[PDB]
Design an enzyme around this catalytic site. Structure first.
Site, PDB file in Angstrom:
ATOM      1  N   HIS A   1       9.933   2.935   6.959  1.00  0.00           N
ATOM      2  CA  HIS A   1      10.214   3.623   5.691  1.00  0.00           C
ATOM      3  C   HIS A   1      10.495   5.118   5.907  1.00  0.00           C
ATOM      4  CE1 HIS A   1       9.220   0.291   3.034  1.00  0.00           C
ATOM      5  NE2 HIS A   1       7.919   0.325   3.284  1.00  0.00           N
TER       6      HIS A   1
ATOM      7  N   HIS B   1       5.409  -0.285  10.278  1.00  0.00           N
ATOM      8  CA  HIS B   1       6.049  -0.622   9.006  1.00  0.00           C
ATOM      9  C   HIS B   1       6.292   0.648   8.182  1.00  0.00           C
ATOM     10  CE1 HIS B   1       6.449  -3.213   5.243  1.00  0.00           C
ATOM     11  NE2 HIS B   1       6.167  -2.026   4.731  1.00  0.00           N
ATOM     12  N   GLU B   2       5.258   1.487   8.034  1.00  0.00           N
ATOM     13  CA  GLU B   2       5.448   2.736   7.292  1.00  0.00           C
ATOM     14  C   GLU B   2       6.423   3.677   8.001  1.00  0.00           C
ATOM     15  OE1 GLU B   2       4.384   2.546   4.262  1.00  0.00           O
ATOM     16  OE2 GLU B   2       3.003   0.889   4.635  1.00  0.00           O
TER      17      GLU B   2
ATOM     18  N   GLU C   1      11.715  -3.056   0.800  1.00  0.00           N
ATOM     19  CA  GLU C   1      10.664  -3.792   1.496  1.00  0.00           C
ATOM     20  C   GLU C   1      11.226  -5.007   2.228  1.00  0.00           C
ATOM     21  OE1 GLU C   1       7.773  -2.648   2.154  1.00  0.00           O
ATOM     22  OE2 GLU C   1       7.266  -1.195   0.674  1.00  0.00           O
TER      23      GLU C   1
HETATM   24 ZN   LIG Z   1       6.515  -1.181   2.791  1.00  0.00          ZN
END
Ligand SMILES: [Zn+2]
Length: 423
Positions: A230, A226-227, A265
């Site tokens: 980003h 997930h990171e 997000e």
């Molecule tokens: Zn996030």
């Protein structure tokens, strides 16, 4: 193929893969006197720093807060990660999670993308030339020995030892197409559970319908991926955390509303909530990115008169056509790459490829107390299968059920201070 470097925390400094690193944020007043910190190059341009993330305004104080606690599932312990044994445990845990991510083609490609996708450098004397937006400094005895390329630095957690986050270094390049070095704050051992409906668990015989919401732990490889999504957005300069998606109207807004979610997000998590994004939103995001890249090609890339290795890296990152001094964006190939990084690469899609359970919605309905799990024990967590180990009967998400024995309860007080792990 892509290689993962192994290390022990006590490995000696060599100036190649093991350095003492000056913080990227060293110039901010809050960071005066901090560092340098021992750092390890796990993959080309990706560094692990076994230290607490402490370098922004909201992470500078690791103590129990003295103000209203507004994350009811946080756990505070300012001493976590201050011993060599905890630093080595953290280093081994991050390495093992990266090995897990590399074990499937989709994860290997994500790591290769982060390794190769350098921010667009500035031009000096006709050549792309490195800045602190693309490098970290090896500091020894108050002198800078060298500047080493870096796209990603992974640290331990901030004040909440069970939280995870991503930070881009410079705020204009994060959203204008250039890209920026990213820092990640990651906790592989202290995890926050989530609810999901499930029916394969020990249940009282007088309950007719067993299929109900149960508690699960995340796979920390999904937490890290997930990171990493980003990070990919930050490296391509296509972040914008100033947009919110309003679930009541289906529109993008520039401020938070009643029932909304930061758009970065929404995309990074994916799943059901991103399946009904309007064509208007998608077209505007694509057009903004295309316009930013067209501007950078004409105003910066076409001023390059020196062919060097940085130009090679950039042509592999950015699809272009033409020759030196007269490049143009390769629209079809840029569109394909952009839509992959925005709409294909997300936590929910990646988790499906790894047979990892994730929750239905990015926002959770209720807080659940964090747990501790020693992911270095291969009987609990393996690189190939995570918690869902088939030979142990834990396939089909069952190893993530929170009642599994390796998920250890943590006692805290009313202020959310860590007291102990219940082994
Ligand atoms: Zn996030």
């Amino acid at each position: 193929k892509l290689e993962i470097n192994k290390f022990n925390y006590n490995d000696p400094i060599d100036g190649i893969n093991v350095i003492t690193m000056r913080p990227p944020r060293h110039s901010d007043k809050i960071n005066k006197g901090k560092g340098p910190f021992k750092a390890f190059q796990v993959i080309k341009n990706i560094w692990i720093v076994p230290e607490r993330y402490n370098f922004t305004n909201n992470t500078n104080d690791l103590n129990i807060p003295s103000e209203p606690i507004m994350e009811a599932d946080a756990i505070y312990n300012p001493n976590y990660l201050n011993t060599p044994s905890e630093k080595d445990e953290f280093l081994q845990g991050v390495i093992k999670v990266l090995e897990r991510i590399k074990s499937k083609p989709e994860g290997e490609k994500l790591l290769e993308l982060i390794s190769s996708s350098i921010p667009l450098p500035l031009v000096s004397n006709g050549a792309l030339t490195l800045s602190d937006n693309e490098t970290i400094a090896y500091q020894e005895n108050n002198n800078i020995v060298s500047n080493l390329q870096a796209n990603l630095v992974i640290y331990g957690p901030g004040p909440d030892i069970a939280n995870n986050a991503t930070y881009g270094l410079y705020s204009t390049p994060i959203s204008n197409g250039e890209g920026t070095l990213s820092e990640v704050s990651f906790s592989p051992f202290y995890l926050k559970p989530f609810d999901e409906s499930y029916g394969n668990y020990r249940s009282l015989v007088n309950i007719v319908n067993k299929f109900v919401k149960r508690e699960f732990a995340p796979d920390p490889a999904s937490t890290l991926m997930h990171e990493l999504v980003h990070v990919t957005h930050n490296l391509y300069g296509i972040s914008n955390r100033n947009f919110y998606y309003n679930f009541d109207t289906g529109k993008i807004e520039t401020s938070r509303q009643q029932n909304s979610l930061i758009f970065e997000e929404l995309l990074t998590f994916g799943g059901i909530d991103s399946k009904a994004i309007s064509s208007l939103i998608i077209k505007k995001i694509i057009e903004t990115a295309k316009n930013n890249y067209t501007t950078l090609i004409s105003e910066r890339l076409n001023t390059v008169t020196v062919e060097n290795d940085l130009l090679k890296y950039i042509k592999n990152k950015i699809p272009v056509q033409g020759r030196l001094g007269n490049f143009k964006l390769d629209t079809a190939e840029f569109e394909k790459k952009l839509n992959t990084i925005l709409f294909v690469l997300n936590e929910s899609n990646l988790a499906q490829r790894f047979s990892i359970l994730v929750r239905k919605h990015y926002l959770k309905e209720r807080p659940i107390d964090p747990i501790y799990v020693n992911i270095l024990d291969d009987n609990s967590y393996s690189t190939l299968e995570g918690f869902n180990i088939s030979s142990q009967g834990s396939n089909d998400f069952q190893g993530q059920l929170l009642e599994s024995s390796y998920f250890e309860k943590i006692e805290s007080n009313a202020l959310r201070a860590f007291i102990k792990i219940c082994p």
